[PDB]
Amino acid sequence: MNFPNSTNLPRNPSMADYEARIFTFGTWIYSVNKEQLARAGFYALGEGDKVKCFHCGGGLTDWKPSEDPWEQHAKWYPGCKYLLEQKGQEYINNIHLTHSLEECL
Ligand SMILES: COC[C@H]1C[NH2+][C@H](C)CN1CC(=O)N1CC(C)(C)c2ncc(Cc3ccccc3)cc21
Ligand code: NA
Ligand SMILES: [Zn+2]
């Protein structure tokens, strides 16, 4: 509902450190690994399994065990500069192609 941040500056610099992000989860009952989420730039909002990226501000919920933090970050927030720094455009391309071909079948 807010536009995604596509600049090279994080929207939430307080959540720029891995450990700051990790503290937001507390006891975490959900399908997806909190360290894997924090590594993908996500921090917990404290409302179910709602997460936001510190950089793009992008929000995600309802984590299925088959859903990967980085893959989901690329699917929904392809313009995130943090995603690009960490993963590269080659990875990001694969993910898009895979998702866009998942639809076909
Ligand atoms: C359609 O859903 C599918 C799920 C399934 N599980 C994975 C991990 C992710 N998928 C996308 C997702 O969660 N999306 C997509 C979209 C961009 C349309 C969106 N908009 C709002 C919310 C709710 C929210 C608000 C504020 C902060 C965090 C979340 C969630 C959401
Ligand atoms: Na919590
Ligand atoms: Zn992001």
Q: What residue ranges do the domains of the chain occupy?
A: 1-105
Interval between CA 56 and ligand 3 midpoint (Å): 4
- The residue whose C-alpha atom lies closest to atom 15 belonging to ligand 1 is 60
For residue 69, the ligand 1 atom closest to its alpha carbon is 8
Record the resolution, in angstroms.
2.4
Within 13 A of 101's CA, how many CA atoms are on the CB side? 6
Q: How far apart are CA 20 and CA 78, in angstroms?
A: 24
Which run of H or of E encompasses 53?
A: strand 51-53
What are 88's two structure tokens?
């590269």
Residues lining ligand 1, judged by CB closer than 6 Å?
A: 50, 52, 59-63, 67, 72, 76
CATH class (in words) of the domain with range 1-105 = mainly alpha
For residue 32, the ligand 1 atom closest to its alpha carbon is 8
Give one DSSP letter per residue of 74-90, joined into a string.
HHH-TT-HHHHHHHHHH
| Packing angle, helices 81-104 and 69-76, rounded to 10 | 90
Residue whose token pair is 């929000």: 59
